[PDB]
């Protein structure tokens, strides 16, 4: 037999611009590493980096010739960041044939080679796969980075081509080498 203090709400979604809803949170931006981002609705995945472009003050993001997003404006500090993809490539296996031996060398294309143990999941791989991420046999070429072969200073004919003047063969006990090819 005591008074109450009631408040009752109800919503509508008749087809119109929605002018009322709740707050959308934020985190703090991190640069120079591969993240998933959400800049005001625009989603993606890449590496954020301080830029040189100057937008016009009403423009929110930039595009290139094939219409991909490659620059964005942060909506709190109004600066311009770059977008660059997280690195990818192919994995190629160099073998001398299984009628002869069983040791191989692995080429990782376009890596810079210090990123190899972390681009592959070398902590999560087999211990027989972890040999080909780190070692003494690490060689950086224009075609990528070659791990598992010995960079000699001779020159022979090409046996298994790699690219940009580099070949690889199985002679020398026996091992897998990597050399600049000779023309004659």
């Amino acid at each position: 037999y005591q008074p109450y203090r009631v408040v009752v709400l109800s919503f509508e979604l008749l087809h119109a611009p929605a002018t009322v809803c709740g707050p959308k949170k934020s985190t703090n931006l991190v640069k120079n590493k591969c993240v998933n981002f959400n800049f005001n609705g625009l989603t993606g995945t890449g590496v954020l980096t301080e830029s040189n472009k100057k937008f016009l003050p009403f423009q929110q993001f930039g595009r290139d010739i094939a219409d991909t997003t490659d620059a964005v404006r942060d909506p709190q500090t109004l600066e311009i960041l770059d977008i660059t993809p997280c690195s990818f490539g192919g994995v190629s296996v160099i073998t001398p044939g299984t009628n002869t031996s069983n040791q191989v060398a692995v080429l990782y294309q376009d890596v810079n080679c210090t990123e190899v143990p972390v681009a592959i999941h070398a902590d999560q791989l087999t211990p027989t796969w972890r040999v080909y991420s780190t070692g003494s046999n690490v060689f950086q070429t224009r075609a990528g980075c070659l791990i598992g072969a010995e960079h000699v200073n001779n020159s022979y004919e090409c046996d298994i081509p790699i690219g940009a003047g580099i070949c690889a063969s199985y002679q020398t006990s026996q091992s897998i080498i990597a050399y600049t090819m000779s023309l004659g």
């Binding site: 005591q2 009752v8 009322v20 985190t27 959400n38 192919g90 044939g97």
Partner: protein
């Protein structure tokens, strides 16, 4: 056989998940409908039309103040990510036992005669008690229900 074979691909995986959004400025005026001076009776419940603001529902849900909170079609953790064109707000004065009929499908003294939630609902109810300051000594004949 002897050669070089392309067996797989690699890709560096993302580590974090950032979100960037503009500053939160234009709040909704809930102080006008939760800290008002005086209220109105049952049959003459006042309506408020709330539009064009950001509404913080977590401070209403976590208030340490009410006695009633129930709703249908929404949960109190979904309310911060779902949008509407218009939100209405009603508030009035009722008694102790006159509260449980405020739901879809009930009858009472004032449910089917003054104030009915229709066949389905979306919004939520919030109620507490008013004997702390809204009942003077010597009787209170200042708010008027329907018979």
């Amino acid at each position: 056989e002897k050669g070089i074979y392309q067996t797989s691909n690699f890709r560096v995986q993302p580590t974090e998940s950032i979100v960037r959004f503009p500053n939160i400025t234009n709040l909704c005026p809930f102080g006008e409908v939760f800290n008002a001076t005086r209220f109105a009776s049952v049959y003459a419940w006042n309506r408020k039309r709330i539009s064009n603001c950001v509404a913080d529902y977590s401070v209403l849900y976590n208030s340490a103040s009410f006695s009633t909170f129930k709703c249908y079609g929404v949960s109190p953790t979904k309310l911060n990510d779902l949008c509407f064109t218009n939100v209405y707000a009603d508030s009035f004065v009722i008694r102790g036992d006159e509260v449980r009929q405020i739901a879809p499908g009930q009858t009472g003294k004032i449910a089917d005669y003054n104030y009915k939630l229709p066949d389905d609902f979306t919004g939520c109810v919030i109620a507490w008690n008013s004997n702390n300051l809204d009942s003077k000594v010597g009787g209170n004949y200042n708010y008027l229900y329907r018979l």
